[PDB]
Amino acid sequence: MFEQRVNSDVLTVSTVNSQDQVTQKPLRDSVKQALKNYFAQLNGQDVNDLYELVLAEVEQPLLDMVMQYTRGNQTRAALMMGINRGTLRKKLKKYGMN
Amino acid sequence: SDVLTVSTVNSQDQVTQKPLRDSVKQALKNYFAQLNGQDVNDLYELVLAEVEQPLLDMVMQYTRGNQTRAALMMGINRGTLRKKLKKYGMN
DNA sequence: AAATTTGTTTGGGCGCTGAGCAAATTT
DNA sequence: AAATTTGCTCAGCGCCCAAACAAATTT
């Protein structure tokens, strides 16, 4: 057999820890921190947009990175993301990536 | 002019702010490196699930479990919010 | 020149939607 | 005692979707 890699550890970013040593925390925790400091700020005006705000911030990179990987090939991009080719096209247009 | 950002630290022990989107880029850039052309199959539901959980975990914690307010705080329908809490068994 | 991708358009369905409501809970 | 939030239902419609095609591009 070979060792377990939980869903958390598939997508990870490099962090430095207490002992000045480069570990790899999940992406989850980056999202957590980005939000917790976002809350620190907004004292105390209302929010009516928090989902789309995040979605936007996450979709742009994903599309970006996959389109680099597939080298502009939308057919393959949409295949590997598991979305409709039309849906992908629509999303690319939302972010001016065409 | 940028709401979503994570704290980073450098060579000179200086903390500096960088956007979450840059952090997502790396996460993937890395993920891609690890697989040597092993076709990826559901990369959207993957990333979605890795972001929806922290987001929910947090606003649900901010609104103190008040589903009504958290749904209004995000852009989404209370019913949708419930469907998502179910999806990740957070309910 | 064959194979693949792009850029449309079409229609079925499912997912997100607000509204409505009684019951439970917070105030 | 009143106000808010929950849990559920329910049409409507808006998005996601595969299927199909011809034209453009890549192989």
Coordinates of C-alpha atoms (C1' of nucleotides) in Angstrom, one line a residue:
Chain A
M1 CA 0.0 0.0 0.0
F2 CA 0.8 3.7 -0.1
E3 CA 0.1 6.6 2.3
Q4 CA -3.1 8.6 2.8
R5 CA -3.5 12.1 1.4
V6 CA -6.7 13.6 2.8
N7 CA -8.8 16.0 0.6
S8 CA -7.4 18.9 2.6
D9 CA -3.7 18.2 1.5
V10 CA -4.3 18.0 -2.3
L11 CA -4.2 21.8 -2.6
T12 CA -1.7 23.4 -0.2
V13 CA 0.4 26.5 0.1
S14 CA 3.8 26.9 1.8
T15 CA 3.9 28.4 5.3
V16 CA 6.8 29.2 7.7
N17 CA 6.2 28.0 11.2
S18 CA 7.2 29.0 14.8
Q19 CA 10.7 27.3 14.3
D20 CA 11.5 29.0 11.0
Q21 CA 10.7 25.9 9.0
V22 CA 8.7 25.6 5.7
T23 CA 5.6 23.4 6.2
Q24 CA 2.5 23.1 3.9
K25 CA -0.9 24.1 5.3
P26 CA -4.1 23.4 3.3
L27 CA -5.7 26.1 1.2
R28 CA -8.7 25.9 3.4
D29 CA -6.7 27.8 6.1
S30 CA -5.7 30.5 3.6
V31 CA -9.4 31.2 2.9
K32 CA -10.1 31.2 6.7
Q33 CA -7.4 33.8 7.4
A34 CA -8.4 36.0 4.5
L35 CA -11.9 36.2 5.9
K36 CA -11.0 36.6 9.5
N37 CA -9.0 39.8 8.7
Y38 CA -11.7 40.9 6.3
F39 CA -14.1 40.8 9.3
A40 CA -11.6 42.8 11.4
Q41 CA -12.0 45.7 8.9
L42 CA -15.7 46.0 8.3
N43 CA -16.6 47.7 11.6
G44 CA -19.5 47.7 11.3
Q45 CA -21.1 48.4 7.9
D46 CA -23.3 45.7 6.3
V47 CA -22.2 43.1 3.7
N48 CA -24.6 41.8 1.0
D49 CA -22.1 40.2 -1.3
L50 CA -19.7 37.9 0.6
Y51 CA -20.3 34.8 -1.6
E52 CA -19.7 36.4 -5.0
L53 CA -16.8 38.4 -3.6
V54 CA -15.1 35.1 -2.7
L55 CA -16.2 33.2 -5.8
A56 CA -14.7 35.9 -8.0
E57 CA -11.4 35.8 -6.0
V58 CA -11.1 32.1 -6.4
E59 CA -12.5 31.6 -10.0
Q60 CA -10.1 34.1 -11.7
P61 CA -6.9 32.1 -10.6
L62 CA -8.4 28.7 -11.4
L63 CA -9.4 29.7 -14.9
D64 CA -6.1 31.4 -15.3
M65 CA -4.0 28.5 -14.2
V66 CA -5.9 25.8 -16.1
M67 CA -5.9 27.9 -19.4
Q68 CA -2.2 28.1 -19.1
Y69 CA -2.0 24.3 -18.5
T70 CA -4.3 23.4 -21.4
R71 CA -2.5 26.2 -23.4
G72 CA -5.7 28.1 -24.4
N73 CA -7.6 24.8 -25.1
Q74 CA -11.1 25.4 -23.8
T75 CA -12.4 21.9 -24.8
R76 CA -9.8 20.3 -22.5
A77 CA -10.1 22.9 -19.8
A78 CA -13.8 22.3 -19.4
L79 CA -13.2 18.5 -19.5
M80 CA -10.7 18.5 -16.6
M81 CA -12.7 21.0 -14.4
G82 CA -15.8 18.9 -15.0
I83 CA -17.9 21.8 -16.2
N84 CA -19.8 22.4 -19.5
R85 CA -17.7 23.9 -22.3
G86 CA -20.3 26.7 -22.7
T87 CA -20.3 27.3 -19.0
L88 CA -16.5 27.7 -19.1
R89 CA -16.7 30.0 -22.1
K90 CA -19.2 32.1 -20.2
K91 CA -17.0 32.3 -17.1
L92 CA -13.9 33.2 -19.1
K93 CA -16.0 36.1 -20.6
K94 CA -17.0 37.2 -17.0
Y95 CA -13.3 37.8 -16.2
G96 CA -12.1 39.0 -19.6
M97 CA -9.9 35.9 -20.3
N98 CA -10.4 35.7 -24.0
Chain B
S1 CA -8.5 48.6 -2.8
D2 CA -8.6 44.9 -2.1
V3 CA -10.7 43.1 0.6
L4 CA -9.5 39.4 0.5
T5 CA -5.9 39.1 1.6
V6 CA -3.7 36.7 3.7
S7 CA -0.7 37.6 5.8
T8 CA 2.7 36.6 4.5
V9 CA 6.3 36.9 6.0
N10 CA 9.6 37.3 4.3
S11 CA 13.4 36.8 4.5
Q12 CA 13.7 40.0 6.7
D13 CA 10.9 38.9 9.2
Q14 CA 8.6 41.5 7.8
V15 CA 4.9 40.6 7.5
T16 CA 3.2 41.7 4.3
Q17 CA -0.3 41.4 2.9
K18 CA -1.0 39.4 -0.3
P19 CA -4.3 38.6 -2.1
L20 CA -6.0 35.3 -1.6
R21 CA -6.2 34.8 -5.4
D22 CA -2.3 34.6 -5.4
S23 CA -2.5 31.9 -2.8
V24 CA -5.0 29.9 -4.8
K25 CA -2.7 30.2 -7.9
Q26 CA 0.2 28.6 -5.9
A27 CA -2.0 25.8 -4.4
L28 CA -2.8 24.7 -8.0
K29 CA 0.5 25.5 -9.6
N30 CA 1.8 23.1 -7.0
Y31 CA -1.0 20.5 -7.4
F32 CA -0.3 20.4 -11.1
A33 CA 3.4 19.8 -10.5
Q34 CA 2.7 16.8 -8.3
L35 CA 0.7 14.9 -10.9
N36 CA 2.9 14.0 -13.9
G37 CA 0.1 14.2 -16.5
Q38 CA -2.4 12.1 -14.6
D39 CA -5.6 13.5 -16.1
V40 CA -7.6 15.7 -13.7
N41 CA -11.3 15.0 -13.6
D42 CA -13.3 17.2 -11.3
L43 CA -11.1 20.1 -10.4
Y44 CA -14.1 22.5 -10.0
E45 CA -16.0 20.6 -7.4
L46 CA -12.6 20.1 -5.7
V47 CA -11.7 23.8 -5.4
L48 CA -15.3 24.8 -4.7
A49 CA -15.4 22.3 -1.7
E50 CA -12.1 23.6 -0.4
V51 CA -13.4 27.2 -0.3
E52 CA -17.1 26.7 0.6
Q53 CA -16.2 25.0 3.8
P54 CA -14.0 27.7 5.3
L55 CA -16.4 30.4 4.1
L56 CA -19.4 28.7 5.7
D57 CA -17.4 27.7 8.8
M58 CA -16.6 31.4 9.3
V59 CA -19.8 33.4 8.5
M60 CA -21.7 30.8 10.4
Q61 CA -19.3 31.5 13.3
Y62 CA -19.6 35.2 12.7
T63 CA -23.4 35.2 12.7
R64 CA -23.3 33.0 15.8
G65 CA -25.2 30.2 14.1
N66 CA -27.8 32.7 12.8
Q67 CA -28.6 31.1 9.4
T68 CA -31.0 33.9 8.5
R69 CA -28.4 36.7 8.9
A70 CA -25.5 34.7 7.3
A71 CA -27.5 34.0 4.2
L72 CA -28.3 37.8 3.8
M73 CA -24.6 38.5 4.6
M74 CA -23.6 36.3 1.7
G75 CA -25.5 36.7 -1.6
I76 CA -27.5 33.5 -1.1
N77 CA -30.9 32.1 -0.3
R78 CA -31.4 30.7 3.2
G79 CA -32.6 27.5 1.5
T80 CA -29.4 27.3 -0.6
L81 CA -27.4 27.9 2.6
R82 CA -29.1 24.9 4.2
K83 CA -28.5 22.7 1.2
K84 CA -24.8 23.6 1.4
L85 CA -24.5 23.0 5.2
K86 CA -26.1 19.6 4.5
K87 CA -23.6 19.0 1.6
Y88 CA -20.7 19.3 4.0
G89 CA -22.6 17.9 7.0
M90 CA -22.0 21.2 9.0
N91 CA -25.7 21.5 9.9
Chain C
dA1 C1' -6.6 16.0 -46.0
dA2 C1' -8.2 14.5 -41.3
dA3 C1' -8.8 15.5 -36.8
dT4 C1' -9.7 18.7 -33.5
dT5 C1' -11.5 22.8 -31.7
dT6 C1' -14.3 26.8 -31.8
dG7 C1' -18.3 29.2 -31.7
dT8 C1' -22.6 29.3 -32.2
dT9 C1' -28.0 27.7 -31.2
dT10 C1' -31.7 24.5 -29.0
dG11 C1' -34.3 22.4 -25.2
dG12 C1' -34.7 19.7 -21.1
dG13 C1' -33.9 19.8 -16.3
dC14 C1' -32.1 21.0 -12.0
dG15 C1' -30.8 24.6 -8.7
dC16 C1' -31.4 28.9 -6.9
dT17 C1' -35.0 32.0 -6.0
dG18 C1' -38.8 34.6 -2.8
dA19 C1' -42.9 33.9 -0.7
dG20 C1' -45.7 31.6 2.8
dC21 C1' -46.3 29.3 6.8
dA22 C1' -46.6 26.9 11.6
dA23 C1' -43.6 25.7 15.2
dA24 C1' -39.5 26.6 17.9
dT25 C1' -36.5 29.7 19.9
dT26 C1' -34.5 34.3 21.2
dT27 C1' -35.6 38.6 22.7
Chain D
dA1 C1' -45.8 38.6 25.5
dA2 C1' -43.4 39.9 20.9
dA3 C1' -40.1 39.4 17.7
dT4 C1' -36.9 36.7 15.3
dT5 C1' -35.5 32.5 13.4
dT6 C1' -36.1 28.1 12.0
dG7 C1' -37.9 24.0 9.1
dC8 C1' -40.6 23.0 4.9
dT9 C1' -43.0 23.6 0.8
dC10 C1' -43.6 25.3 -3.8
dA11 C1' -44.2 27.4 -8.1
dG12 C1' -41.2 30.3 -11.6
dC13 C1' -37.3 30.7 -14.0
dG14 C1' -32.6 31.1 -14.7
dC15 C1' -28.5 28.6 -15.2
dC16 C1' -26.1 24.3 -16.5
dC17 C1' -26.2 21.1 -19.4
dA18 C1' -25.3 17.6 -23.8
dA19 C1' -26.3 17.4 -28.5
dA20 C1' -25.5 19.1 -33.0
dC21 C1' -23.6 21.6 -36.4
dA22 C1' -20.5 24.3 -39.6
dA23 C1' -16.7 27.0 -39.9
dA24 C1' -12.0 27.8 -38.4
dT25 C1' -7.5 25.8 -36.8
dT26 C1' -4.2 22.4 -35.6
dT27 C1' -2.4 18.2 -36.4

